[PDB]
Design a protein around this ligand. Structure first.
Ligand SMILES: C[C@H](CS(C)(=O)=O)Nc1n[nH]c2nc(Oc3ccc(F)cc3F)ncc12
Length: 346
């Protein structure tokens, strides 16, 4: 049966939610989207409810709405944000115009936790382990996060971690901004068709920052950032240069004075030698040669957490819709079907 819904004004819009959800309260000061904390009286869980902003206003937006719902419905993993519930107050497709998504409420993001400070090596081990455990799962479904950074890593009091915003402008990537500091060079400057290992670069940047309390590559712009990157990892060799399909980018890279890879032990003074080794394997310029999430989990740095029988992979994820061209109402009908067919977790 259909639950009873009640109306409330929260984030300049009227939220219409099932009675089970009580004490709705906006969180994140707009940073996470139109999101409210709530108490789910049915499960006893503290939850986060996200209302999608004008989800079917254009073809691009309607497809994005479908994409996010498909992604959230697929993800069933401890270290990845998943769906506890999805609902609409609509009784039919013709009425359908709002989508509400429900997940676990997490106390903070990693960025607000790290607070300019060095973390203990054990804390770094545990946090990075969880990120890699989640990424192994995500990557096994042929999904790429693309924008992994401390602000989309949600963490509770016990340091338990869940990955937000997976699989989803020029101005906000401009300048001295955290929005670009964790990006692999190949994607930051559109060198080539990029793969899953862009996410591994990001983990390396995050891991280094947890170990030192400092941004690894705090570039003031795209060019400044590239120079910071290349000083640490060295300028590309001939092999990688061939792989830069963008003739323009390839030609610029060649104009830079060649630099050798630095000694990471001299860069990360005092750090666990195993952490240094892993950082070296993650922060490789050639993306073909970066360590994978599955491989990184088996690295000696995670000896006290690694368990090959407790690091699950995902069911197959059909993303053929990505190369499909449809009308707004067609994307909207596909979305409606996915809402209606939702089965809650036990
Ligand atoms: C990280 C943030 C910190 S807080 C409570 O200060 O806003 N807490 C959050 N816990 N759970 C969260 N979920 C989101 O986004 C959602 C993602 C998927 C959903 F189904 C529902 C959501 F609300 N954003 C944010 C959070």
């Amino acid at each position: 049966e259909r639950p009873t819904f009640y109306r409330q004004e929260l984030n300049k819009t009227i939220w219409e939610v099932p009675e089970r959800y009580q004490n709705l309260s906006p969180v994140g000061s707009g940073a996470y989207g139109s999101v409210c904390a709530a108490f789910d009286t049915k499960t006893g869980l503290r939850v986060a409810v996200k209302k999608l902003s004008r989800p079917f206003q254009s073809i691009i937006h309607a497809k994005r709405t479908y994409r996010e719902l498909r992604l959230l419905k697929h993800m069933k993993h401890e270290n990845v944000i998943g769906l506890l519930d999805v609902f609409t107050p609509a009784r039919s497709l013709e009425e359908f115009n709002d989508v509400y998504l429900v997940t676990h409420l997490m106390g903070a993001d990693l960025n607000n936790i790290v607070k300019c400070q060095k973390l203990t090596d054990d804390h770094v081990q545990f946090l990075i382990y969880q990120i890699l455990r989640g990424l192994k799962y995500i990557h096994s479904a042929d999904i790429i996060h693309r924008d992994l950074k401390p602000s989309n890593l949600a963490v509770n009091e016990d340091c338990e971690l869940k990955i937000l915003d997976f699989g989803l402008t020029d101005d906000e990537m401009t300048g001295y901004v955290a929005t670009r500091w964790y990006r692999a060079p190949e994607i930051m400057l559109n060198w080539m068709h990029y793969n899953q290992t862009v996410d591994i670069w990001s983990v390396g940047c995050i891991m280094a920052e947890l170990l030192t309390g400092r941004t690894l590559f705090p570039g003031t712009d795209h060019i400044d950032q590239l120079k910071l990157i290349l000083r640490l990892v060295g300028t590309p060799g001939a092999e990688l240069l061939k792989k830069i399909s963008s003739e323009s980018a390839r030609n610029y890279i060649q104009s830079l004075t060649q630099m050798p890879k630095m000694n990471f032990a001299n860069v990360f003074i005092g750090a666990n030698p195993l952490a240094v080794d892993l950082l070296e394997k993650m922060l490789v310029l050639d993306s073909d040669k970066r360590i994978t999430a599955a491989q990184a989990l088996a690295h000696a740095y995670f000896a006290q957490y690694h368990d090959p029988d407790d690091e699950p992979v995902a069911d197959p994820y059909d993303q053929s819709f990505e190369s499909r061209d449809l009308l707004i109402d067609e994307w909207k009908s596909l979305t409606y079907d996915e809402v209606i067919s939702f089965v809650p977790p036990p």
